[PDB]
Amino acid sequence: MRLEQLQAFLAIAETGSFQKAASKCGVTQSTISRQIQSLEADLGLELFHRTNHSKLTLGGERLLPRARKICLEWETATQELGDLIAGKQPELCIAAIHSLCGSYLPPVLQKFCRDYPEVQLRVTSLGSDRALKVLKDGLVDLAIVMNNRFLTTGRD
DNA sequence: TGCATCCGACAGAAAAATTTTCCTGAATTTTGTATAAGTAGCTACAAAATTCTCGTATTAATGCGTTTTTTGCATAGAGAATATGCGTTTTTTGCA
């Protein structure tokens, strides 16, 4: 089921000479045909045209459900670790408190704008006992509450 | 013509009568005899097929020396953690 035999023999299943698997998938006639000769038995259905000529017998067009769906997951990964940020491109959630959400740092908004202008942002609540809970985990993606709490997370 | 009274054992002999059984037509538990038609199969024949075999051709299979690669390897930093630490703090003692 693995990638090379998956993607190789299947898109084979609509073409061969395994020269078709070597292309698109990558597995050459070497590790494809040899491993697929024994694999032709492991899911339990003849995929290509057993050394014949042109066929779609029981390839992977009907095996990808229990097959491709998986490696489509890492196919999204095969694309890239995202485009902006590796994980959760939008990750800038500010604290909800009654002190300083509004007005003390407009040159920081300047630099954020200078490095990246009008960039969408988000928010969470913390508490300050609950800020503690969710910052020693680091929930509050950006977090500000009396430093006398929330102590754990990474880097001590 | 009106007042009482009463009723609704036994024996012999010949004829009949129920079954039984062999003879005699009647036309069945049925089943018997030959001839000619006809119904169904056997011998023969058709061949171009189709398909079995030997040879050649491409192709797919299978092994390897090597590409890069994934995963196990080590030793370098950091970020508090952990003392001293006073220095500050909480503990512990006697008088009214």
Side-chain angles (χ1 to χ4, degrees), chain A residues 15-36:
Chain A
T15 41
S17 316
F18 293 64
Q19 267 87 244
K20 275 103 169 182
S23 46
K24 183 178 179 180
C25 182
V27 199
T28 46
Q29 325 302 296
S30 308
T31 303
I32 167 95
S33 155
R34 295 176 64 186
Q35 253 162 46
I36 294 169

mmCIF file of all heavy atoms in Angstrom, chain A residues 15-36:
data_model
loop_
_atom_site.group_PDB
_atom_site.id
_atom_site.type_symbol
_atom_site.label_atom_id
_atom_site.label_comp_id
_atom_site.label_asym_id
_atom_site.label_seq_id
_atom_site.Cartn_x
_atom_site.Cartn_y
_atom_site.Cartn_z
ATOM 1 N N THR A 15 -2.066 2.837 -17.122
ATOM 2 C CA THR A 15 -0.781 2.563 -18.042
ATOM 3 C C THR A 15 0.561 1.731 -17.523
ATOM 4 O O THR A 15 0.754 1.943 -16.340
ATOM 5 C CB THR A 15 -0.276 3.878 -18.651
ATOM 6 O OG1 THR A 15 -0.363 4.887 -17.644
ATOM 7 C CG2 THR A 15 -1.054 4.302 -19.878
ATOM 8 N N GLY A 16 1.601 0.988 -18.248
ATOM 9 C CA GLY A 16 2.826 0.062 -17.826
ATOM 10 C C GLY A 16 4.182 0.011 -18.360
ATOM 11 O O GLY A 16 4.904 1.021 -18.355
ATOM 12 N N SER A 17 4.553 -1.249 -18.527
ATOM 13 C CA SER A 17 5.974 -1.382 -18.782
ATOM 14 C C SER A 17 6.536 -0.862 -17.453
ATOM 15 O O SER A 17 7.723 -0.690 -17.420
ATOM 16 C CB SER A 17 6.297 -0.596 -20.016
ATOM 17 O OG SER A 17 5.332 -0.819 -21.033
ATOM 18 N N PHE A 18 5.700 -0.728 -16.390
ATOM 19 C CA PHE A 18 6.061 -0.164 -15.046
ATOM 20 C C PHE A 18 6.821 1.146 -15.262
ATOM 21 O O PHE A 18 7.079 1.867 -14.280
ATOM 22 C CB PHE A 18 6.709 -1.242 -14.170
ATOM 23 C CG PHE A 18 5.742 -2.338 -13.811
ATOM 24 C CD1 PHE A 18 5.207 -3.158 -14.792
ATOM 25 C CD2 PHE A 18 5.327 -2.520 -12.504
ATOM 26 C CE1 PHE A 18 4.293 -4.147 -14.471
ATOM 27 C CE2 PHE A 18 4.417 -3.513 -12.184
ATOM 28 C CZ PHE A 18 3.905 -4.328 -13.165
ATOM 29 N N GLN A 19 7.121 1.452 -16.513
ATOM 30 C CA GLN A 19 7.845 2.675 -16.968
ATOM 31 C C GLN A 19 6.963 3.892 -16.669
ATOM 32 O O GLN A 19 7.465 5.033 -16.696
ATOM 33 C CB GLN A 19 8.169 2.581 -18.460
ATOM 34 C CG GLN A 19 9.550 2.009 -18.750
ATOM 35 C CD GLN A 19 9.538 0.502 -18.828
ATOM 36 O OE1 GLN A 19 10.157 -0.185 -18.019
ATOM 37 N NE2 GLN A 19 8.826 -0.024 -19.810
ATOM 38 N N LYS A 20 5.688 3.608 -16.396
ATOM 39 C CA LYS A 20 4.647 4.536 -16.046
ATOM 40 C C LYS A 20 4.653 4.810 -14.559
ATOM 41 O O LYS A 20 4.413 5.932 -14.112
ATOM 42 C CB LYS A 20 3.366 3.955 -16.535
ATOM 43 C CG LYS A 20 3.185 4.320 -17.980
ATOM 44 C CD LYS A 20 3.482 3.227 -18.983
ATOM 45 C CE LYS A 20 2.991 3.661 -20.403
ATOM 46 N NZ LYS A 20 3.122 2.721 -21.576
ATOM 47 N N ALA A 21 4.982 3.772 -13.784
ATOM 48 C CA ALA A 21 5.116 3.941 -12.320
ATOM 49 C C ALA A 21 6.405 4.715 -12.049
ATOM 50 O O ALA A 21 6.368 5.684 -11.257
ATOM 51 C CB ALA A 21 5.154 2.584 -11.672
ATOM 52 N N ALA A 22 7.506 4.299 -12.687
ATOM 53 C CA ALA A 22 8.778 5.044 -12.551
ATOM 54 C C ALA A 22 8.480 6.528 -12.758
ATOM 55 O O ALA A 22 9.025 7.352 -12.002
ATOM 56 C CB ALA A 22 9.782 4.531 -13.550
ATOM 57 N N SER A 23 7.647 6.851 -13.750
ATOM 58 C CA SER A 23 7.230 8.262 -13.951
ATOM 59 C C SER A 23 6.085 8.570 -12.983
ATOM 60 O O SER A 23 5.434 7.622 -12.535
ATOM 61 C CB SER A 23 6.822 8.504 -15.377
ATOM 62 O OG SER A 23 5.968 7.467 -15.838
ATOM 63 N N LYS A 24 5.863 9.845 -12.666
ATOM 64 C CA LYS A 24 4.747 10.245 -11.763
ATOM 65 C C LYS A 24 5.054 9.774 -10.337
ATOM 66 O O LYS A 24 5.249 10.640 -9.464
ATOM 67 C CB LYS A 24 3.411 9.675 -12.257
ATOM 68 C CG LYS A 24 2.185 10.081 -11.447
ATOM 69 C CD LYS A 24 0.876 9.538 -11.993
ATOM 70 C CE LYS A 24 -0.330 9.928 -11.165
ATOM 71 N NZ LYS A 24 -1.585 9.380 -11.731
ATOM 72 N N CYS A 25 5.095 8.456 -10.113
ATOM 73 C CA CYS A 25 5.311 7.935 -8.739
ATOM 74 C C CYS A 25 6.807 7.945 -8.417
ATOM 75 O O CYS A 25 7.187 8.592 -7.424
ATOM 76 C CB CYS A 25 4.779 6.518 -8.588
ATOM 77 S SG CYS A 25 4.985 5.882 -6.905
ATOM 78 N N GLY A 26 7.617 7.251 -9.223
ATOM 79 C CA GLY A 26 9.074 7.296 -8.996
ATOM 80 C C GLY A 26 9.654 5.895 -8.906
ATOM 81 O O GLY A 26 10.765 5.680 -9.430
ATOM 82 N N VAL A 27 8.924 4.979 -8.263
ATOM 83 C CA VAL A 27 9.378 3.563 -8.125
ATOM 84 C C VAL A 27 9.714 3.035 -9.524
ATOM 85 O O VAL A 27 8.800 2.985 -10.370
ATOM 86 C CB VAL A 27 8.310 2.692 -7.436
ATOM 87 C CG1 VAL A 27 8.900 1.404 -6.885
ATOM 88 C CG2 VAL A 27 7.578 3.458 -6.343
ATOM 89 N N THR A 28 10.977 2.660 -9.747
ATOM 90 C CA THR A 28 11.425 2.152 -11.071
ATOM 91 C C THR A 28 11.045 0.675 -11.225
ATOM 92 O O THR A 28 10.687 0.045 -10.210
ATOM 93 C CB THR A 28 12.930 2.372 -11.269
ATOM 94 O OG1 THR A 28 13.598 1.955 -10.078
ATOM 95 C CG2 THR A 28 13.280 3.812 -11.572
ATOM 96 N N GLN A 29 11.121 0.167 -12.460
ATOM 97 C CA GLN A 29 10.816 -1.202 -12.790
ATOM 98 C C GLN A 29 11.411 -2.184 -11.808
ATOM 99 O O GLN A 29 10.766 -3.197 -11.518
ATOM 100 C CB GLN A 29 11.366 -1.465 -14.156
ATOM 101 C CG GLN A 29 11.246 -0.289 -14.947
ATOM 102 C CD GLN A 29 9.861 0.091 -14.999
ATOM 103 O OE1 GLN A 29 9.061 -0.628 -15.518
ATOM 104 N NE2 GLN A 29 9.531 1.158 -14.369
ATOM 105 N N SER A 30 12.489 -1.709 -11.175
ATOM 106 C CA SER A 30 13.299 -2.367 -10.118
ATOM 107 C C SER A 30 12.435 -2.687 -8.897
ATOM 108 O O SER A 30 11.971 -3.835 -8.776
ATOM 109 C CB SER A 30 14.398 -1.427 -9.695
ATOM 110 O OG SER A 30 15.123 -0.959 -10.822
ATOM 111 N N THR A 31 12.238 -1.680 -8.038
ATOM 112 C CA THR A 31 11.487 -1.815 -6.760
ATOM 113 C C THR A 31 9.970 -1.819 -6.983
ATOM 114 O O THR A 31 9.251 -2.066 -6.001
ATOM 115 C CB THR A 31 11.896 -0.722 -5.765
ATOM 116 O OG1 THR A 31 13.308 -0.808 -5.571
ATOM 117 C CG2 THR A 31 11.188 -0.841 -4.433
ATOM 118 N N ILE A 32 9.491 -1.522 -8.196
ATOM 119 C CA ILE A 32 8.013 -1.553 -8.416
ATOM 120 C C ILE A 32 7.602 -2.974 -8.828
ATOM 121 O O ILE A 32 7.111 -3.697 -7.948
ATOM 122 C CB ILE A 32 7.523 -0.446 -9.376
ATOM 123 C CG1 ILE A 32 6.086 -0.672 -9.857
ATOM 124 C CG2 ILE A 32 8.492 -0.218 -10.524
ATOM 125 C CD1 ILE A 32 5.045 0.066 -9.049
ATOM 126 N N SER A 33 7.869 -3.371 -10.078
ATOM 127 C CA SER A 33 7.487 -4.705 -10.620
ATOM 128 C C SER A 33 7.846 -5.840 -9.650
ATOM 129 O O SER A 33 6.966 -6.679 -9.377
ATOM 130 C CB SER A 33 8.096 -4.934 -11.980
ATOM 131 O OG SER A 33 8.239 -6.322 -12.241
ATOM 132 N N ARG A 34 9.087 -5.860 -9.151
ATOM 133 C CA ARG A 34 9.528 -6.934 -8.219
ATOM 134 C C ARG A 34 8.626 -6.954 -6.978
ATOM 135 O O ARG A 34 8.029 -8.013 -6.702
ATOM 136 C CB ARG A 34 10.997 -6.749 -7.828
ATOM 137 C CG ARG A 34 11.972 -6.901 -8.987
ATOM 138 C CD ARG A 34 13.404 -6.615 -8.576
ATOM 139 N NE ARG A 34 13.899 -7.568 -7.594
ATOM 140 C CZ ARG A 34 15.076 -7.478 -6.985
ATOM 141 N NH1 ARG A 34 15.887 -6.470 -7.258
ATOM 142 N NH2 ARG A 34 15.437 -8.395 -6.105
ATOM 143 N N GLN A 35 8.538 -5.828 -6.263
ATOM 144 C CA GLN A 35 7.709 -5.753 -5.029
ATOM 145 C C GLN A 35 6.226 -5.919 -5.379
ATOM 146 O O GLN A 35 5.524 -6.594 -4.605
ATOM 147 C CB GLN A 35 7.952 -4.445 -4.275
ATOM 148 C CG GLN A 35 8.760 -4.619 -2.996
ATOM 149 C CD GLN A 35 9.344 -3.314 -2.515
ATOM 150 O OE1 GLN A 35 8.669 -2.289 -2.467
ATOM 151 N NE2 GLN A 35 10.616 -3.344 -2.152
ATOM 152 N N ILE A 36 5.783 -5.367 -6.518
ATOM 153 C CA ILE A 36 4.350 -5.457 -6.943
ATOM 154 C C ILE A 36 4.011 -6.887 -7.380
ATOM 155 O O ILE A 36 2.821 -7.232 -7.336
ATOM 156 C CB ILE A 36 3.984 -4.417 -8.024
ATOM 157 C CG1 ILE A 36 4.066 -2.986 -7.484
ATOM 158 C CG2 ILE A 36 2.622 -4.714 -8.631
ATOM 159 C CD1 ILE A 36 3.976 -1.921 -8.552
#
